Structure 1
């Protein structure tokens, strides 16, 4: 203290980065390559484990550029002080399934991914490459008092 322990669970994992002095969170990288078609849901593995101390919670949340440009929706996960397992990114491709087809996948910048081997995809499908910035981790202090039942509130 004040130090957060980080455990890499595979060779695909990458150490989170907080480059600027002013930055609030840590860049979280994907440890796997996954293709998400319209409406598809998944929990993307980071192969990263952290030991958040008591009196804090980690917010594994979306990234500003990715969430604004793409239909990829990350549900902010609340990381407990007592969770030492693999950090998973709760994600949904919120693009509508209009049953149309295209030869182009989309990257996390919403650009068309040009392939030399031509394949057929559902329109609005995204590919997340291994090692890409898709999320960030912001840790905040928490207040956890012992609950007391009342019939009416005082003051």
Structure 2
């Protein structure tokens, strides 16, 4: 109770850190330096393993700062209780490939990185540095009941079969 086991898989790995006392998640550091071109997909290694206890799920999800400023989209990962593998960040550079070329790379602050050597990149390309906080881990309790098949449900709800914007907008 009130203790989570964390296993670092390499020297490139870093221990997750909570920002404030009442904050929800633990900021996840990147273990590798990755360059992502427009519309490219990848799984960023963190070299961090956790042992979520039974009755809980981990949500490997994006940070508001990175997601709002950059075209980097992270799909929220559902970390199962007992997953002792490498926590991978399911990421996509969602910037459009307009077939235009630039001489700069973007950082996770959406700013152009200063380089001494001349290089030609695609417009919308991002670079993630090793040891940068690009994601966070929020752990929530879960309900895992036994499924019971029925002909119809025992009670009629006020909601019914209404959905997908059945109310106003």
Q: Does the TM-score normalized on the shorter chain lie above 0.5? A: yes
**Per-residue displacement from partner, 1:114-153 (whole Å, max 9, x unpaired)?**
1011110000000000000000000000000000000010
* 1:64 paired to 2:64: yes
Q: State the alpha-carbon separation in 1 of the partners of residues 53 and 114 from structure 2.
A: 45
TM-score by length of 2: 0.90
Deviation, 1:87, is 0.1
Per-residue Cα deviation, 1:4-40 (whole angstroms, up to 9, x for no partner): 0000000000000013111100000000000000000
In the aligned structure 2, how far is the partner of 1:121 from the partner of 1:113? 12
Q: TM-score, normalised by structure 1?
A: 0.98
Q: Secondary structure at the match of 2:68?
A: helix
Structure 1's consecutive aligned runs of 4 or more residues displaced over 2 angstroms after TM superposition are none
Structure 2 unaligned regions, length at least 5: 154-169
Q: Give the equivalent residue in structure 2 for 1:8.
A: 8
1:147 is matched with 147
Structure 1 residues not aligned, in runs of 5+ = none
C-alpha RMSD of matched pairs (Å): 0.5
Greater Rg over alpha carbons, structure: 2
CA offsets 1:88-117 (integer angstroms, 9 cap, x no match): 000000000000000000000000001011
2:65 is paired with a residue of what secondary structure?
helix
Q: Which residue number in structure 2 is paired with residue 95 of structure 1? A: 95
Farther-moved stretch of structure 1 (17-26 vs 128-137): 17-26
Q: How many residues align?
A: 153
